[PDB]
């Protein structure tokens, strides 16, 4: 009812929202203790399915689940772990200087191996680490966590807009699509662009910028790419991060919390959307 609260109790083995900002684009970790099984399934047999059986098992080594399940993944944890992967180096790598000095690359180094191992056996990182929200409160303990980081529509950026102002956490991120500029409202999405066996199972996390519908986004997902050179398949999944109902309030900064480039985005209808991955 244009104001909501959500809560999930996890560890600070992940994000450590005390080390994060007030505004962070948190993911969950849905199906957290999953993927020894789907490592074996869903892949053609030339992928040697005994890789992710150890790969996530080295992740929680860096992080026993207990009663506080592994979850609440930060926005930082994918950018810096793919910083060595995608086509931005020493600028996306400034996100690694943000994490390891505030959060830890010990958990990144196990997970950057997962980002070459999850995508290896066709266990693609979309529909795992589902969207949760914008880190409203951080009522966490010392080594444990209790975060309210509301999902559920536009109210996350009104109740942090009548007061976290939604950073993009990298100037390389918030992909400035539509340089063909005009007035309107912004429509935000979460795309994982892949490269399968060309760049050896590439991982990518960035947000697009468009005044485009979901039907005007799929052909926009076929155009503007140079990573078509694959053949397996089902690359470039995306869901709706929702509407920023203003293109006027975007910004360009390098000040956060290590000087990391960052984009202020004030006022967002967080339509949670749905994923799609077929081609």
């Amino acid at each position: 009812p244009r104001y909501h609260l959500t809560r999930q109790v996890t560890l600070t083995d992940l994000c450590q929202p005390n080390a994060e900002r007030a505004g962070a684009l948190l993911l969950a970790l849905r199906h957290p203790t999953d993927l020894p099984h789907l490592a074996r399934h869903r892949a053609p047999p030339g992928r040697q399915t005994e890789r992710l059986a150890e790969a996530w098992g080295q992740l929680l080594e860096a992080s026993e689940s207990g009663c506080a399940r592994a979850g609440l993944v930060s926005f930082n944890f994918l950018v810096a772990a793919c910083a060595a992967a995608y086509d931005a180096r020493d600028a996306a790598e400034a996100v690694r200087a943000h994490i390891t000095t505030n959060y830890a690359g010990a958990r990144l180094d196990r997970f950057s191996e997962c980002l070459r191992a999850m995508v290896h056996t066709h266990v693609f990182p979309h529909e795992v680490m589902r969207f949760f929200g914008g880190l409203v409160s951080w009522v966490t303990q010392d080594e444990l966590a209790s975060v309210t980081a509301v999902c559920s529509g536009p109210q996350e950026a009104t109740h942090t807009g009548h007061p976290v102002t939604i950073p993009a956490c990298a100037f390389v991120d918030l992909d400035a699509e539509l340089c063909l500029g005009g007035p309107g409202a912004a429509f935000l999405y979460l795309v994982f662009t892949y490269r399968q066996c060309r760049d050896q199972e590439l991982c990518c996390v960035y947000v697009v910028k468009s005044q485009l519908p979901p039907r005007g986004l799929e052909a926009a997902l076929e155009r503007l790419f140079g990573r078509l050179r694959i053949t397996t398949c089902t690359y470039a999944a995306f869901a709706e991060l929702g509407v920023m109902p203003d293109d006027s309030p975007r910004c360009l900064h390098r000040t956060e919390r290590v000087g990391v480039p960052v984009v202020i985005l004030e006022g967002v209808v967080w339509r949670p959307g749905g994923w799609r991955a077929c081609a």
Partner: protein, 307 residues
């Protein structure tokens, strides 16, 4: 609603102000999200591209990259439109006008189709503001998916001639009775070609490795034909399935991948999505509060969200 207005820009033909009154509940394709916008991008002259007007398959592609909007209230100064793509958050269920020869149902998903009918052109003309208006025809979605397959395949017959001139017209439609004839006047090629390619390229990926085992059971299909009712009615007479009847190819690597289960996945990925990648997305659903089971031609039906 997240209110969006379109003003009356310049002058009025005095009966044509009443023509804007009887368009309450229709749909405007405005290619933006504005707090105010001129009426110039509204009409079909904006639908016309550089030099050339779209065909009824190009208008599908023209209605692709624009935004539908519902006429809510009609002022002599403005027209308040509600942005369907975002502002469908209406427990008041903002109302639409059915301009269609089909009496629908209760509970139909409703998708929008350009005017292609033989007698429901929806042509209203403004001469003070020199503009032409084609309103889309809201229709039920299986009947909508029965139309778009006809018009592309009619343009598939625009590539190759070969056959004698007596072709099956693709111009007789069937809803419980109700013989419908549509318009076949012009078929622009690029609207056919780009629609044909995605019909090709999606049907490429919808075949996989474990898909091939299913092809063995094609003679198994006709074994059910002469021994039941359901199968024999399922098997169409104008089908290639009755024509193709007149094998593992071992290559077995590993055999723990579930090859038959993986076949139905990627087939559904692309051949399962063939109505919506060719046509417009349905977001309008029939929902009347009074318990009325159908909605008459010309009525004001209440409209709820995405199906």
């Amino acid at each position: 609603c997240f209110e969006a207005d379109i003003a009356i820009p310049s002058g009025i033909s005095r009966p044509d102000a009443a023509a804007l009154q009887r368009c309450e509940g229709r749909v405007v394709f405005l290619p933006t999200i504005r707090r105010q916008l001129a009426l110039a991008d509204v009409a079909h002259e904006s639908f016309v591209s550089g030099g050339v007007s779209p065909d009824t398959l190009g208008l599908l592609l023209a209605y692709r990259r624009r935004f539908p909007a519902v006429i809510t209230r009609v002022l002599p100064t403005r027209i308040v439109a509600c942005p369907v793509d975002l502002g469908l958050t209406h427990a008041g269920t903002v109302n639409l006008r059915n301009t269609s020869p089909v009496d629908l149902c209760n509970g139909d998903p409703v998708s929008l189709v350009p005017p292609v009918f033989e007698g429901q052109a929806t042509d209203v003309r403004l001469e003070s503001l020199d503009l032409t208006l084609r309103f889309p025809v809201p229709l039920p979605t299986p009947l909508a998916r029965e139309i778009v397959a006809r018009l592309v395949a009619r343009g598939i017959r625009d590539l190759n001639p070969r056959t004698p001139g007596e072709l099956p017209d693709l111009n007789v439609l069937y809803y419980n009775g109700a013989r419908l004839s549509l318009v076949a006047d012009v078929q622009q090629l690029a609207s056919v070609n780009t629609e044909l390619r995605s019909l090709v390229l999606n049907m490429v990926y919808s075949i996989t490795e474990g898909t091939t085992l299913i092809l063995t059971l094609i003679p198994r299909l006709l074994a059910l034909s002469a021994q039941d009712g359901y199968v024999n009615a399922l098997l169409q007479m104008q089908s290639v399935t009755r024509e193709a009847a007149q094998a593992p190819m071992l290559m077995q690597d590993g055999e723990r991948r579930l090859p038959l289960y993986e076949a139905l996945v990627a087939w559904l990925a692309h051949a399962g999505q063939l109505g919506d990648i060719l046509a417009l997305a349905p977001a309008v659903r029939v929902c009347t509060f009074d318990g009325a089971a159908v909605v008459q031609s010309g009525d004001m039906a209440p409209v709820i969200r995405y199906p």
